């Protein structure tokens, strides 16, 4: 090397796969490649192949598992400055990159990824450093290395992919049904068709099934490009794999206990639900046997290692074990509850329906106005007032309510609840209606009825049922179209078309990426074990088989812009556009804890979003003619999206204020609105006569011993109405995993690394992003304080709507805002 040459000083921090010298040696070989300096082809300077050279063991910062090498780089010549680097690993198990550091002012590598045998890869494995660039930015030898690594993400849209893949494609979801293992597990594709729209998903690739061309072959492992599984230092933070353990391992195991005669099959009171958080469930030895080995199942239940499992005590039931059973608690969980986003405001009456009366039946509601206890308001009053409300689930259900009704063991209505807006500000219900499709060709007689509240006698009994009936209702559509199809599903396609079109090194690659964390790992593992055919979830809600249909069916009518948090308020009725005040939208129900919070926090995204933009785009024209940003929202939307690509509300994406638009609801869907719907399921859901997920009979004719039951033993007729003990219990713990933050969870206003830009005004914004969280986070703690919003924010269940606040500790807290859907 040159004789006045100096080295640059590197230092590379990895994590082996599971000593160190083995990484010595020829084992691992860095190139630094020119940002400044290129060939005669225009592409940046290679430098020589370079070993890690020793354990650098000086480093008293370093996370648990990293490891650091030194290794030094000749520069002589007119080489410039390394703007990226090539990486060959020449031992034959994968590890994991952190990150490269070159010194003397630093040049930062931030990697985090994994890097397989250097035989398996087609192209040399390349890292940018941290410099962020619009393409018309991008440095003139990284062009072609900047799209060429595109290029290699996206793949030609063949091939069965491997674990160590990072390719990034769409499929329909053709992989749910399992029509080699039975014709009944047969299920419609979901997507690509005008039958059954739906989300694209992460292409596997697998090929068909031996029976069916059209369906997707099952596999052990259900691909995700390699760093979309990052992996974990502690096994208990896996909690994406307990869905899978849930299915194969433990359903199995309750299943045997049952089949054994080993409890009783159904829940004969109340108290026998209790039971399941205070002394536990006694089970054979093998369930807890089969149980107590087992990463993330073991920490769903404490056990005394040999009969006993019990669960947590859910937060609904931790101050009052009866509050759930109140009126006030069943109209305030629709506004602070697991699923707080589907009541409506109700602007005439009686509701309507859309539906076809030649195929269902008279449509019209038998509500009638007198019947209603609206404390001394007339109709015309409480409707010109803007206090009548509704849980409107009549024509949602009534197209599926025949095909539910026809399974064994599934009966539903399709109900309807009518919610009075009281002067004190909490809701209370009034009247709830039960409606099934009415046909010359009906074998059953059961009739629609009105159940209108009550504290006394058998009309006591109808009207808790009356309210299970809603909630299963509930329970369905929030985990299907609430939960599911609007986070988790819709997600995914721009996840994909972020990583096929936006490079690494593009400023909205880096804003957005962070909200993806898990998702499609999570999605893969729920295609496999949650969503499929006879798997938790069918097994476990009302609809069975037709569940996930059902949420193509309500997919026809999601609309992108309407995620935003005002725009579903004012669609929803329960605000208006207001100018006047600081969010831009009223409330109609004031202390509505889930909408007042998240506007919030809406806010705070909002105002992230408008600081970053600015920073890579000063004009509209810039968006324009950004041409991997113009690839991206195209491919978003006519592919990811595509049964809907040609719809009339798609942001075009031409102007400052579309990407920022588009930005925020795509940041604000995966991190506030999923944890708003997410991390409530145990606290309000682990009390299963709280969040029944299915329903087993109709209402009880007079004359039977179902209706003297009725009267002699509520609880009984309560229980045998709902889900039974067996799905309980399975339903239950994939809930408790689902509600639980791993301890390496990124939340709202956190990154994993504190240089993924060098851009420092952007790290400025994002700091003061956090602070405003912060901020917040104190404010949402007041209005949990504030004694005159007890009725909405607490209830007659004391507990504190916590849903939306930012930060959180490890585990089944009730509060905390992950950057994305991770689990
Ligand atoms: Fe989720």
Redesign the pocket.
Same mark, same amino acid.
């Given at each position: 090397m040159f004789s006045a040459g100096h080295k640059i000083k590197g230092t590379v921090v990895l994590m082996p796969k599971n000593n160190l010298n083995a990484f010595l040696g020829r084992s691992v070989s860095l190139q630094l490649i020119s940002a400044t300096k290129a060939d005669a082809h225009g592409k940046g300077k290679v430098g020589k192949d370079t070993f890690l050279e020793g354990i650098n063991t000086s480093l008293p910062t370093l996370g648990a598992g990293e490891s650091a090498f030194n290794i030094h780089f000749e520069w002589d010549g007119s080489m410039g400055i390394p703007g990226a680097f090539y990486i060959k690993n020449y031992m034959q198990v994968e590890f994991f990159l952190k990150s490269l550091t070159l010194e003397a002012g630093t040049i930062r590598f931030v990697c985090n990824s994994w890097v397989y045998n250097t035989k398996l890869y087609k192209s040399v494995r390349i890292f940018f450093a941290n410099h962020t660039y619009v393409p018309s930015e991008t440095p003139a030898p990284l062009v072609e290395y900047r799209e060429e690594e595109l290029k290699s993400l996206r793949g030609n849209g063949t091939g069965e992919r491997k674990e160590y893949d990072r390719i990034y494609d769409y499929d329909v979801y053709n992989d749910l049904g399992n029509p080699d293992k039975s014709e009944k597990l047969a299920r419609p594709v979901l997507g690509g068709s005008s039958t059954f729209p739906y989300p694209r998903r992460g292409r596997t690739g697998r090929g068909p099934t031996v029976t069916d061309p059209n369906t997707e072959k099952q596999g052990e492992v259900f691909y995700v490009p390699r760093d979309e599984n990052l992996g974990h230092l502690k096994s208990k933070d896996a909690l994406e794999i307990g869905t899978k353990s849930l299915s194969q391992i433990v359903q199995p195991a309750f299943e045997s206990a049952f089949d054994l005669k080993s409890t009783p099959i159904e829940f004969h009171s109340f108290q026998d639900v209790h039971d399941l958080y205070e002394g536990g469930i006694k089970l054979p030895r093998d369930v807890i046997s089969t149980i107590i080995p087992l990463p993330v199942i073991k920490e769903l239940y404490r056990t005394d290692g040999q009969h006993i499992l019990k669960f947590p005590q859910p937060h609904v039931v931790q101050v009052s074990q009866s509050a759930w059973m109140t009126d006030e608690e069943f109209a305030r969980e629709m506004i602070a509850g697991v699923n707080p986003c589907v009541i409506r405001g109700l602007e005439e009456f009686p509701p309507k329906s859309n539906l076809d009366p030649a195929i269902y039946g008279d449509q019209s509601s038998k509500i009638t106005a007198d019947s209603l206890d609206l404390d001394g308001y007339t109709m015309d009053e409480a409707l010109g007032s803007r206090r009548l409300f509704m849980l409107d689930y009549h024509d949602i259900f009534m197209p599926y309510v025949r095909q539910i009704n026809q399974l064994n063991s599934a009966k539903t209505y399709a109900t309807r609840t009518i919610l009075f807006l009281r002067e004190d500000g909490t809701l209370k219900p009034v009247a709830i209606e039960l409606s099934l499709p009415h046909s010359a060709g009906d074998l059953s007689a059961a009739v629609s009825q009105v159940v209108l509240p009550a504290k006394e006698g058998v009309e006591s009994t109808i009207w808790l049922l009356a309210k299970a009936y809603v909630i299963v209702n509930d329970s369905c559509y929030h985990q299907l179209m609430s !939960?599911w199809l609007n986070? !988790?599903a819709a997600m995914e396609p721009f996840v994909i078309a972020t990583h096929r079109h936006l490079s690494v090194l593009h400023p909205i690659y880096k804003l957005l990426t962070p909200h993806y964390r898990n998702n499609m790992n =999570?999605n893969a593992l729920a295609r496999q074990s949650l969503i499929n055919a006879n798997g938790i979830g069918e097994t476990t809600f009302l609809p069975s088989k037709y569940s996930v249909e059902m949420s193509s069916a309500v997919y026809k009518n999601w609309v992108f812009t309407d995620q935003a948090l005002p725009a579903d308020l004012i669609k929803r009725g329960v605000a208006i556009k207001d100018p006047s005040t600081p969010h831009g939208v009223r409330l109609l129900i004031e202390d509505y804890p889930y909408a007042a919070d998240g506007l919030e926090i809406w806010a705070a995204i909002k105002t992230w979003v408008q600081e970053y933009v600015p920073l890579y785009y000063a004009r509209d024209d810039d968006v324009k003619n950004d041409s991997e940003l113009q690839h991206w929202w195209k491919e978003a939307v006519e592919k990811g999206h595509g049964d809907l690509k040609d719809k009339p509300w798609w942001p075009k994406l031409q102007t400052l204020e579309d990407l920022v638009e588009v930005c925020l609801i795509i940041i604000w869907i995966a991190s506030a609105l !999923?944890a708003a719907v997410?991390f409530g399921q145990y606290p309000y859901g682990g009390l299963i006569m709280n969040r029944p997920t299915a329903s087993r009979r109709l209402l009880p004719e007079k004359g039977t011993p179902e209706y003297e039951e009725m009267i002699n033993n509520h609880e009984k007729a309560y229980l045998r109405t709902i889900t039974s003990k067996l799905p309980t219990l399975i339903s239950l713990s994939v809930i408790e995993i689902?509600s639980t933050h791993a301890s390496d969870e990124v939340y709202l206003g956190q990154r994993d690394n504190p240089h993924w830009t060098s851009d420092s005004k952007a790290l400025q914004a994002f700091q003061k992003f956090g602070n405003k969280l912060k901020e917040i986070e104190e404010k949402l703690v007041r209005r949990n304080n504030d004694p005159s919003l007890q009725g909405n924010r607490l209830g007659p269940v004391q507990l504190p709507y916590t849903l939306l606040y930012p930060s959180s500790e490890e585990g089944l807290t009730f509060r905390g805002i992950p950057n994305s =859907?991770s =689990?």
């Open positions: !939960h986070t !988790h =999570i !999923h997410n689902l =859907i =689990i």
